[PDB]
């Protein structure tokens, strides 16, 4: 997901 | 002593623009699409801001994400209210430097009543002479002001964290005060102010939820994280599974 993507960043 | 405040001031997000074309005629789709985009952009900053808050890492990973996902609306409205107060004395809603709402946009956005409450909240910052420090602490506390009624993964670390942030807010008040009766009165006003944020956020929650559902029919675009959080997390709030923590009844 995009959120998961941003959280990882 | 200034340790806690130094941190909050240090991590406070800078200016964030929405990318709105102020040269194009105002329209419901254009305004809301710009607000949604602004939400996506600010969400990124709220994530990085929250992660840097004192003791935030003590929380379980899943709770870290949870509080951010439930509280983003109240956090963003509160800060927006502050920007409006400081940038245009609450005359308009200062969402972003490139997205300032006047009465016309408030009407074209189809959420005039909600904008009115937000402007009212903005006015309170003035009516109460809220200090930049009280603002920062109250905003931090808003991240720990809404949880599922069934509790979080590790409810204990959260309660400890929320309790300490209340303590810090109490510290700030008792700072330039030696009268215990004055402190109690200021705390009462601030907590009342904090509570008033929740009803406003709920109205926005209901509104964005309805808008997501019929977005394809009104040409309103929802960025990826927004669409996900509004379809998965917001409903839990609207259905009563996740509720705000109120100081007063
Ligand atoms: C959080 C934002 C965007 C960030 C901000 O400054 C406050 C403002 C409050 C209204 C929200 C908006 C994001 C997009 C939403 C959720 C729209 O879908 C309807 C209500 C809007
Ligand atoms: Na999610």
Numbering used by the authors:
A (entry chain B): 99 to 107
B (entry chain A): 670 to 918
Paper text:
To understand how the AR AF-2 accommodates tryptophan residues, structures of AR in complex with peptides containing tryptophan substitutions at the +1 or +5 position, or both, were determined. In FxxLW and WxxVW, the −2 serine forms a bidentate hydrogen-bonding interaction, making hydrogen bonds to both Glu897 and the backbone amide group of the +2 residue. However, the presence of a hydrogen-bonding partner on the indole side chain enables an additional polar interaction not seen in the phenylalanine-rich motifs between the indole nitrogen and Gln738. Unexpectedly, this additional interaction in the +1 pocket does not occur with Trp+1 of WxxVW. While similarly distanced to make the same interaction, the plane of the indole ring is rotated about 20° relative to that of WxxLF, causing it to be at a poor angle for strong hydrogen bonding to Gln738. Trp+5 of WxxVW is bound similarly to phenylalanine residues at the same position. Only the six-membered ring of the indole group is fully buried in the pocket. The five-membered ring of the indole side chain sticks out, solvent exposed.
